[PDB]
């Protein structure tokens, strides 16, 4: 109809105006500014602890708030809490569904969340008078496999599903309070800001969106990738984030300036990225490639400075401690390794 | 124990108990057969479940001292390639196809028919990168109505390059050959074809026979005898 044609034309001319406005402020590049700093030397890490006991592919992990404990999730149907200092096991949580894709650890250390491919997010209580671990709340309402989940606080949690939607839950009531829509492809990962006010979600449509927790409405949209976006994480400062996609290319974006800053790729790498994480100071970028090893990138010079090759299968989960003392990498060979 | 305190030896003992429990529970799930059920829609994949009935749907049953676990993931309604790698260690794949759908037309497109949709979905599943050595079991459902449908309307609509006797036996054989021709390996993957009967004993027996052959082939490869 005539109304359809005129509305489509209006949408197109907004896109041209957005592109023109974005290109107008691209006065300089980050490479020119950081061309004067001295490059960091070769980064060498060794495995200090080896964590064994899993009998299936490891799909997720998350460091504790005290930088001493961590949790791991595998497809065998078990959730194991590890003491990284002495390798000892603290808890072993059976799962109702053997298929799990994500896990999370509460900032207060009292609860652990898990879920994936079952449309339900389960919350487990660690500090129980009876001395065991029991489920406390099951959140349902999604129509697709859950890809990520992060604890906003002791009472609220945000999850992303495969039905191009994101929701914010309330553990006390168990009902959704805010729903985020607008994506075209399945959302694969999310990250929370240090101040827990905003968050970013990457989807399969090669686009990232910035959302507002309090307002519940989208703020900005970032594009530039050519394939599915697998990982995302904020900068320690909180004004930038890095994305890892399946075209063998990592990118760094910004919030105040809606333009691309760096591209991290090599002609010898044709393999996708499964995990992305920064360091304490935001200088080293750890990207978990699915070609049986991990790479270390300098965020300011986009130059490789170290390779972590100690796994015999795909690397799927990667984490960094709060104090930046060590990193933990999990793989499909059911082995966790702490590098320092 | 020379340096550990009184509160650290007990912690080590607790960790050893956890390790023992994990090993005991890990050897019980290594003797269970895992099967993946796939279909193209209204192909009878819900009737085949009731025949051997004791997000994702899990069904567990026993037959001749062997435990089977079948997973239904047809209601996921999401991208297939984003989670298909999870079902990489399955023993075999059960496929349901209705051979009486050669005359019905798809709702989305009038020109497209349901028979070709099943054919293309089978080709994608069979030639996947994660199922290079996974055997496929093919079931031809709703074979009773095929006989009555083949006399009033010839099967030339679906296959315009077919010239047969217009009988049930020749038509069924031609359809089976077409589906079996989609295989591109022919050396590492074996396809088992069966016609579903009214009774349920034959269907379960065929599945039991198929998985037994698959298990022995894996056992021979593992021990290096073949």
């Amino acid at each position, epitope marked *: 109809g005539s109304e359809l044609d005129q509305l489509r034309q209006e949408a197109e001319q907004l896109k041209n105006q957005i592109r023109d406005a974005r290109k107008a402020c691209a006065d300089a590049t980050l490479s020119q500014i950081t061309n004067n700093i001295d490059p960091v030397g070769r980064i060498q890490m060794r495995t200090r602890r080896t964590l064994r006991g899993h009998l299936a592919k490891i799909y997720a992990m998350h460091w504790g708030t005290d930088s001493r404990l961590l949790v791991s999730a595998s497809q065998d149907g078990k959730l194991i809490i590890w003491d990284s200092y002495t390798t*000892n096991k603290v808890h072993a949580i059976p799962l109702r569904s053997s298929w799990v894709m994500t896990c999370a650890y509460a900032p207060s250390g009292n609860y652990v969340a898990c879920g994936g491919l079952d449309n339900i997010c389960s919350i487990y209580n660690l500090k129980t008078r*009876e001395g065991n671990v029991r489920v406390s709340r099951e959140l349902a309402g999604h129509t697709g496999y859950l890809s990520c989940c992060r604890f906003l606080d002791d009472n609220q949690i945000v999850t992303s599903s495969g039905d191009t939607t994101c929701a914010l839950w309330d553990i006390e009531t168990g009902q959704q309070t805010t729903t985020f829509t607008g994506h075209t492809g399945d959302v694969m990962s999310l990250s929370l800001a240090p101040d827990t006010r905003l968050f970013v979600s990457g989807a399969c449509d090669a686009s990232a969106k910035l959302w507002d927790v309090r307002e519940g409405m989208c703020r900005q949209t970032f594009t530039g990738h050519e394939s599915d976006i697998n990982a995302i994480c904020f900068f320690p400062n909180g004004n930038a984030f890095a994305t890892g996609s399946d075209d063998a290319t990592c990118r760094l974006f910004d919030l105040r300036a809606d333009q691309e800053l760096m591209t991290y790729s090599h002609d010898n790498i044709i393999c996708g990225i499964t995990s992305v994480s920064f360091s304490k100071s935001g200088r080293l970028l750890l990207a978990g490639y699915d070609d049986f090893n991990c790479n270390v990138w300098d965020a300011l010079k986009a130059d490789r400075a170290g390779v972590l090759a100690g796994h015999d299968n795909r690397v799927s989960c990667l984490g960094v401690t709060d104090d930046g003392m060590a990193v933990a990498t999990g793989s499909w060979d059911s082995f966790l390794k702490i590098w320092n | 124990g020379c340096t550990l305190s009184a509160e650290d030896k007990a912690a080590v003992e607790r960790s050893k108990m956890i390790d023992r429990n994990l090993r005991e529970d890990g050897e019980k799930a290594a003797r269970e057969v895992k099967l993946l059920l796939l279909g193209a829609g209204e192909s009878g994949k819900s009737t085949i479940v009731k025949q051997m009935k004791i997000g994702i749907v899990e069904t567990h049953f026993t037959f001749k001292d062997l435990h089977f676990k079948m997973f239904d993931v047809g209601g996921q309604r999401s991208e297939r390639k984003k989670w298909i790698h999870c079902f990489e260690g399955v023993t075999a794949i059960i496929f349901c196809v209705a051979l009486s759908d050669y005359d019905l037309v798809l709702a989305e497109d009038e020109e497209m028919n349901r028979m070709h949709e099943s054919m293309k979905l089978f080709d994608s599943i069979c030639n996947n990168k994660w199922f290079t050595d996974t055997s496929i079991i093919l079931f031809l459902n709703k074979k009773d109505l095929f006989e009555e449908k083949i006399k009033k309307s010839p099967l030339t609509i679906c296959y315009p390059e077919y010239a047969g006797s217009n009988t049930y036996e020749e038509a069924a054989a031609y359809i089976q050959c077409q589906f079996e021709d989609l295989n591109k390996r022919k050396d590492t993957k074996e396809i088992y074809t069966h016609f579903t009967c009214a009774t349920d004993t034959k269907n379960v027996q065929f599945v039991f026979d198929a998985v037994t052959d698959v298990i022995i082939k894996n056992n021979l490869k593992d021990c290096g005898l073949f």
Partner: single-chain antibody
Amino acid sequence: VQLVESGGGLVQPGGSRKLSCSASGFAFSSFGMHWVRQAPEKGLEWVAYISSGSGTIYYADTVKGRFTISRDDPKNTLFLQMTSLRSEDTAMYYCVRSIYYYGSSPFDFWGQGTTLTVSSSDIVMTQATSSVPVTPGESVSISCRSSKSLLHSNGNTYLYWFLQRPGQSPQLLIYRMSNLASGVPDRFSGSGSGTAFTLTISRLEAEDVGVYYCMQHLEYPLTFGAGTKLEL
């Protein structure tokens, strides 16, 4: 959670008796158990300890080779047996639960208690103070002293502070000399280093009257301190 104990009574010097305790409200299969003996009008001392799964069994040197402790996981019952009871075997017995992992608080629930009467190197814990009058509304300090250093290499300080009200089972207050227990107010606090340790109360009320004991857990046997009493 509760513990019910039975089997006490009056026995002759020549004879044997057994004591039993029944656990409920928690997972008895993953909790270590301890036995505590409290002599009348005197202090209390540890007796025996059994681990989770009957892995390690420890006995006190005083009654080593005479007492037998056994555990029954399916029925949630712990047994103790005494072969030959002497004159100095008359006291009140308590059963204590304890779980050991990173961040756990052992010696949490002390049970109720049972009575038994009979017809007629190691770190020592000392407490110079025996009784001090006090008026509610002012700070109270209690000091305990040891003979060695309880600070381990890992940084832990295995010292426990617990209170016993008149006619009531002891309740844990401070574990590892720094961490507060669960269900107790914030008035109680503990601070110490090396050999000398102190327990401090900010505001005093009528429910704080009792007897204070200091325990060490660096190595077996576990030795308690002299009873310190507070008068209203």
